Design a protein around this ligand. Structure first.
Ligand SMILES: [Mg+2]
Ligand SMILES: [Zn+2]
Lengths: 100, 227, 167, 229, 50, 36, 73, 151, 149, 136, 220
RNA sequence: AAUCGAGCGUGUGA
């Protein structure tokens, strides 16, 4: 939603004629890449943590036991980007040409 | 049927032409595993006809890819059928639904490395229930021609062979419908002079049962008592 | 060995001016950069082997008293053999300039028409081989796989050495 | 030192579903015995199943019977799942004859004193013509496991081509086995438990006989280890 | 009936394989409950409601 | 029993030395019999 | 050290020499008819030859000496 | 006719007779490797899970050619050079090729993880055998942080 | 909606159920995803694809056993396979798979006699495909031949 | 295809001095990796030009380059196959150790085929204003 | 048919060492190998008779964590060493033993006096090592009879986990077995190691007859 | 000895 708000604001600026086509295209790609990175950051960390009640009754956070996290962090099968695609967001995609 | 489907199985099933469909709405007059006779209703009759729709069904007919095309009726006596309703399901069809495979109980877990790298572990119950057993029909042709020494004869006179191979033969050398034949067994008997056996045989490594025998004879040929 | 105008740089002028080791380092480093950008790890030794195979020829600039003509392109091994012969005679060796041939060209420019023909351009290689009356000694791997004899490598190397020593 | 298990309850909620209680068992022996018995049951319970069929006027299963709603292949598949209990013999030949409109069910096989049909409502096929007469000979053997028709062959390997409608035999009478180990309110000890075996079968086998046969098999197998040379 | 590797799901990214499996379990459960009601010879009204 | 491969051009005398007979007719085989 | 030779490398020296000795020993046991002393526990002949090589009692020089002695008589 | 003599002879022949398995395309040297074959009742070849990286082979329907070295010298050089046991490193960079993946890596990762409040936490053990007993008997969990005497 | 359908059937909404090993009976530590999936049998059967030959049929222009499954053919031990055998240094294996496994008129018969006599012999041989090459170069207008030594 | 390790030791003294590729702040490979298995053409000297670390005739192994790291060696010259003074092949020491055995390369190993395969195979994995110091 | 069964032709044991033996039988029925292996493993792991150390007394301990000097190894290490002691009790169910040896030097297990009912399995099991002239230790050890394993998480001064079962190392593996025609059979190989209280194969035999006695209610 | 064979197009897997 924050990414949508910022792209709407940059579209409003473009409607006001502040930036150009190529510069706006690059800036929007950059901010969407930043949103992708933030989503991956808020995903992988939420996927590697647990709240475990210890012998004292207090919480000792540890590495998560999630099966897909085991697959990724273990390196058995899968990478960080694949987990981002199936659990976060797919991200930017390419046109038939090189352009994103 | 697929327990989980998309709803497009009906369109594929009825638009492929492999299922016997009801041309005119009526009432079933007779259902057999090979024939369906429909007494057409009077609301959709046209003057000058009896009002009977007859649907013969393809039964174990070989397809292009050596599969089985078979039609099973999906209606019983007295059932009122309407225009466009499925009367017999073709292969991979269940009550007008496209049925490519079988619904199976699966568990997503490694099992002593027997599903390593997309491998599949299968319960013995699947084999027992014959869930994925398939029928494969092949066609073998025997053509009688004229040789440079003389014409070739269809007969049971094959020399230097055992008595067991001569037990399944008849007066002409063609073994009967439904016989269990394996690779190396003679289907259509024929010998060439030199004599040498020029008969058709089952390909080695293939063992099946004969379901159809078709004979094409050009004019002027003496057909034997088997023929 | 110093660049006058900036821009993309050719390998052949690098060889003719900067030297041999300079072009070998250039090729090895650039190939390994391409491989590592994809996260692939290969040794530099293999690229050095191929670069050596790319540098088996020499151009006779001034033959002098040597048996070589002027302007020809001859195998560098023959040039070293002639230099050894002249050193045994005590005479100075003929000067030579190395050439950086392409991979296809170096394969085609081999001293064996059998391998060049079995690789590409069979009609050409055969035409020059027949015009020149070429002779192909059985010494490469292809020349022995095609005739069905043991390759000069691995467990077959000893057999080839025995053949050389017996004749 | 060990409290031996004993049959304390055999509850027959239905003809194909029975709960058998074993009590008492010490800690650990419950799961051990439950797994051993479940595997021996699922693996080596003998039974009777349809093996060969010979319908008159039929040469092979890849054909149609006159005035019959289902294919001969479908008929053989329906006869595969026929629950028959045979007493005293390991090889019986039933005959089924029928004619006229109606569903030919399992209640129409010619009655014999040595054969019992557990489910008479089992629909074998249907007839759709009044003159359509169906007559079949069904050979039932007593076996164990699953013997596919492709593997088993005739003794002399030469049998009637017109007959020999071979049906795959699923000799196993049991279809589902669960077992639970539960705490028993024993007034003598507190470490004792009870083993509840919940069995779902085809109705052709007595649960007590099946469990005793499994125990006999297990003991005979362990006898090789006990009697070691 | 079939044992599948969960490792082929994340790398190959075919996740419809999991949702379809869950839906198959749900459908077969509803079918087995209808089967339980039919074995009991329950009244037609019960089947209608369920 | 060989150590190399020699390639060159062939004399018309060499080509004639290779052959055992001169080919005249353009027909391959008769179709009434199987005789070439 | 039978399928993959590590221990017999320090017992036969050069592995090309090992290949040559293995070929000669196989052809001898096939044609020379020498009676071995190792009992046959359903083992391949090449396996027994590798065992005798990793024993280290037979090498190339001794084989050459025995060949010369045999060609003398 | 598949007699008992045939079975005995097949048993004789298969043992210690290397067989070269080969998946196309043969991209590098390891695309063909020798194996010791074992008789399977089925009609498909059983492939070792570790050599799947050398062949670039996954069991999603890949086919694999099978070649039989015939003479003694080819058998010897299959045993000495071609065998997958004698080819552990990659000629491209010297790195090992038999590095496990998928199921093995996940299993080892699971069996070496730590849990903060696992069953059996704090216990002091006499060695690996006691850990084996405590796991198999269901007394101590696999992720329990303990203190063990290691040799 | 799938969770609700699981609830109506009295099933765990997580789609995972305590599963038990059939060999030991021990419950798996974590819940296992169990369900129903639509499996398809493909027109790729080992009854078809499995094939293996030994001393079958040969072509006529070359003596290489050509063909495939339908024609009882051999396996194309192509160029890259020869490269792989070269990189191993396995020279005798190349000699087998170029002269013995194909392209051999007389050496493929006494080798079979040796095998049925319990011998491995007669590896050297001259490929008849190379003879075909020589004949189609000579008949093209070029003199190519072998030397005495 | 025709290139085979045909000799044992040519005794050449020319070779390539090698530095680690640096693009910015990072180092692509340590000196160890690119010298691992190589053969030096000279005596490697400890900084201060006083002591000889390793002789020129030894096979640079993991232990030797670990010692070099301990001594913080800067640049090494090794016998490459390009500067090999052998006719009709390459000697063993100009090609360094066999990356699949661990010992010295035997005579008669076709490294050209090995090189070609080792380069081609990864091909299937292939696609298709100011400078600042960031370290102390 | 449904009554007769094939007889094991090849029953072989390889004696790697005294307590290390490889026992296997050819052939077993399909699924029988895993059933027998799991049952035997469970009964060996938790239903085998033996004796072990359960309680020990160290005087002067009244707080949570206390220390005692003059001993080379920590009290935790000493009790852990005492845990693995192989003790046989033939007459009674509970006997209290005392260790009595001092002096600077090696400390074996054969210096404790022989008992009529208690016999020590191995005389070389070190307990500790004294190093001081004024350091001498003599504690009491409670030996209880039992079966299996009991952690001391819940329920004299110190409580020691008891390894009642004489089983040191039990593992079973099932391989594919082959005959003239059938190739889907099971072959069970058992790897057994013991602490010396009972022979390796003898413990398996004892548990096999224990399990065969548990099913005497169904003997025909 | 009986024993036997190719090209082109097309669609498929790896
Ligand atoms: Mg692929
Ligand atoms: Zn050199």
């Amino acid at each position: 939603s924050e990414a949508e708000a910022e792209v709407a604001e940059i579209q409003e600026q473009f409607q006001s004629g502040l930036v150009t086509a190529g510069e706006r295209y690059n800036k929007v790609i950059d901010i969407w890449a930043a949103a992708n990175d933030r989503v991956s950051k808020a995903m992988m960390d939420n996927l590697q943590t647990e709240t475990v009640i210890n012998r004292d009754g207090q919480e000792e956070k540890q590495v998560s036991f999630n099966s897909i996290y085991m697959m990724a962090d273990s390196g058995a099968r899968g990478s960080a980007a694949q987990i981002r695609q199936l659990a976060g967001m797919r991200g930017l995609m390419a046109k038939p040409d090189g352009s994103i | 049927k697929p327990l989980v489907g998309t709803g497009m199985e009906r369109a594929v099933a009825v638009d492929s032409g492999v299922t016997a469909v009801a041309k005119r709405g009526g009432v079933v007059q007779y259902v057999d595993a090979s024939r369906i006779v429909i007494k057409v209703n009077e609301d959709e009759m046209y003057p000058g006809e009896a009002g009977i729709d007859i649907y013969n069904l393809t039964k174990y007919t070989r397809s292009n890819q050596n599969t089985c095309i078979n039609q099973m009726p999906c209606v019983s006596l007295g059932e009122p059928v309407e225009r466009g309703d499925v009367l017999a399901d073709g292969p991979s069809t269940d009550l007008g639904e496209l049925a490519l495979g079988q619904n199976m109980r699966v568990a997503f877990m490694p099992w002593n490395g027997y599903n390593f790298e997309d491998s599949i572990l299968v319960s013995e119950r699947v084999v027992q229930e014959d869930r994925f057993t398939t029928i494969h029909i092949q066609e073998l042709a025997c053509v009688s021609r004229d040789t440079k020494l003389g014409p070739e004869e269809i007969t049971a006179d094959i020399p230097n062979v055992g008595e067991a191979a001569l037990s399944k033969l008849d007066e002409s050398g063609i073994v009967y419908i439904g016989a269990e034949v394996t690779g190396g067994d003679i289907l259509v008997g024929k010998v060439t002079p030199k004599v040498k056996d020029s008969s058709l045989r089952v390909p080695n490594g293939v063992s099946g049962t004969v379901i159809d025998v078709q004979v094409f004879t050009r004019d002027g040929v003496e057909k034997d008592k088997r023929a | 060995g110093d660049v006058i105008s900036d821009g993309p740089e050719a390998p052949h002028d690098i060889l003719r001016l900067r030297g041999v080791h300079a072009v070998t380092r250039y090729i090895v480093n650039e190939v390994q950069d391409v491989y590592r950008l994809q996260g692939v790890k290969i040794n530099d030794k293999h690229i050095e082997v191929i670069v050596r195979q790319m540098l088996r020829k020499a151009t006779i600039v001034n033959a002098g008293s040597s048996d070589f003509l002027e302007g020809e392109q001859v195998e560098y091994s023959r040039v070293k053999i002639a230099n050894r012969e002249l050193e045994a005679n005590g005479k100075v060796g003929a000067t030579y300039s190395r050439d950086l041939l392409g991979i296809t060209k170096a394969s085609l420019a081999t001293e064996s028409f059998i391998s060049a023909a079995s690789f590409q351009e069979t009609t050409r290689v055969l035409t020059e081989a027949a015009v020149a009356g070429k002779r192909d000694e059985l010494r490469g791997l292809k020349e022995n796989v095609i005739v069905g004899r043991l390759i000069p490598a691995g467990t077959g190397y000893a057999y080839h050495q025995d053949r050389m020593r017996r004749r | 030192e060990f409290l031996k298990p004993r049959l304390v309850d055999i509850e027959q909620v239905s003809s194909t579903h029975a709960k058998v209680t074993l009590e008492p068992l010490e800690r650990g022996f419950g799961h051990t015995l439950g797994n051993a018995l479940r595997r021996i049951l699922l693996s080596s319970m003998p039974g009777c199943a349809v093996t060969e069929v010979e319908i008159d006027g039929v040469l092979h299963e890849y054909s149609t019977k006159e005035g019959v709603q289902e294919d001969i292949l479908e008929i053989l598949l329906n006869l595969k799942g026929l629950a028959v209990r045979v007493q005293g013999k390991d090889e019986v030949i039933l005959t089924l004859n029928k004619s006229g409109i109606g569903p030919v069910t399992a209640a129409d096989i010619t009655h014999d004193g040595d054969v019992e049909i557990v489910k008479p409502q089992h629909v074998i096929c249907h007839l759709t013509d009044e003159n359509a007469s169906i007559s079949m000979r069904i050979k039932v053997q007593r076996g164990r496991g699953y013997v596919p028709a492709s593997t088993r062959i005739h003794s002399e390997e030469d049998e009637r081509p017109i007959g020999r409608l071979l049906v795959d035999a699923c000799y196993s009478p049991v279809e589902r086995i669960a077992y639970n180990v539960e705490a028993a309110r024993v007034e003598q000890r507190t470490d004792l438990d009870k083993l509840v075996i919940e069995m779902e079968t085809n109705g052709t086998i007595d649960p007590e006989e099946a469990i005793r046969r499994a125990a006999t098999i297990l003991a005979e197998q362990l006898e090789a280890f006990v009697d070691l040379r | 009936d079939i044992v599948l590797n969960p490792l082929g799901v994340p790398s190959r990214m075919n996740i419809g394989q999991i949702l379809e499996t869950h839906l198959g379990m749900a459908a077969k459960g509803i079918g087995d409950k209808i089967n339980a009601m039919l074995k009991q010879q329950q009244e037609v009204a019960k089947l209608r409601e369920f | 029993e060989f150590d190399a491969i020699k390639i060159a051009l062939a004399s018309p005398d060499m080509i004639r030395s290779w052959s055992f007979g001169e080919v005249k007719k353009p027909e391959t085989i008769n179709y009434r019999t199987f005789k070439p | 050290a039978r399928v993959t030779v590590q221990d017999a490398v320090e017992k036969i020296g050069n592995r090309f020499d090992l290949v040559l000795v293995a070929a000669r020993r196989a052809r001898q046991m096939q044609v020379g008819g020498k009676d071995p002393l190792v009992p046959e526990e359903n083992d391949k002949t090449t396996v027994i030859a590798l065992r005798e090589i990793e024993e280290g009692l037979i090498n190339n020089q001794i084989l050459d000496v025995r060949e010369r002695q045999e060609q003398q008589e | 006719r598949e007699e008992a003599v045939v079975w005995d002879i097949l048993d004789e022949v298969i043992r210690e007779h290397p067989v070269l398995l080969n998946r196309a395309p043969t991209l590098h040297r390891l695309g063909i490797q020798a194996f010791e074959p074992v008789l399977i009742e089925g009609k498909a070849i059983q492939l070792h899970p570790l050599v799947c990286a050398a062949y670039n082979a996954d069991f999603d329907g890949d086919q694999m050619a099978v070649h039989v070295p015939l003479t003694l010298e080819a058998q010897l050089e299959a045993r000495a050079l071609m065998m997958s046991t004698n080819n552990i490193l990659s000629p491209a960079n010297g790195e090992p090729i038999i590095v496990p993946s998928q199921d093995v890596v996940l299993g080892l990762y699971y069996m070496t993880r730590d849990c903060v409040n696992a069953k059996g936490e704090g216990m002091v053990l006499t060695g690996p055998k006691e850990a084996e007993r405590l796991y198999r008997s269901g007394l101590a969990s696999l992720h329990a942080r303990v203190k063990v005497r290691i040799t | 909606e799938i969770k609700e359908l699981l609830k109506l059937g009295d099933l765990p909404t997580s789609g995972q159920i305590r599963l038990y090993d059939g060999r030991t009976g021990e419950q798996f530590e974590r819940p296992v995803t169990v369900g129903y999936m639509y499996m398809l049998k493909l027109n790729h059967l080992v009854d078809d694809k499995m094939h293996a030959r030994s001393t079958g049929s040969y072509s006529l222009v070359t003596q290489q056993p050509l063909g495939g499954k339908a024609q009882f053919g051999g396996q194309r031990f192509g160029e890259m396979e020869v490269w792989a055998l070269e990189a191993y240094g396995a020279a005798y294996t190349l000699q087998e798979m170029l002269t013995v496994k194909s392209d051999d008129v007389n050496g493929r018969t006494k080798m079979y006699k040796n095998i049925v006599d319990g011998n491995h012999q007669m590896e050297p041989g001259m490929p008849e495909s190379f003879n075909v090459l020589l004949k189609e170069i000579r008949s093209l207008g070029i003199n190519i031949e072998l030397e005495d030594e | 295809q025709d290139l085979v390790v045909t000799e044992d030791d040519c005794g050449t003294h020319e070779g390539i001095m090698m530095t680690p590729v640096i693009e910015g702040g990072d180092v692509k490979e340590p000196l160890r990796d690119r010298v691992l298995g190589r053969v030096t053409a000279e005596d490697v000297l400890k900084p201060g030009t006083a002591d000889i670390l390793v002789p020129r005739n030894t096979l640079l192994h993991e232990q030797w380059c670990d010692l070099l790291e301990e001594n913080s060696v800067d640049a090494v010259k090794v016998r490459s196959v390009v500067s090999c003074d052998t006719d009709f092949g390459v000697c063993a020491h100009c090609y360094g150790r066999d990356l699949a055995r661990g010992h010295i390369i035997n005579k008669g190993e076709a490294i050209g085929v090995i090189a070609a395969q080792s380069i081609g195979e990864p091909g299937t994995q292939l696609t298709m204003s100011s400078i600042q110091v960031k370290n102390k």
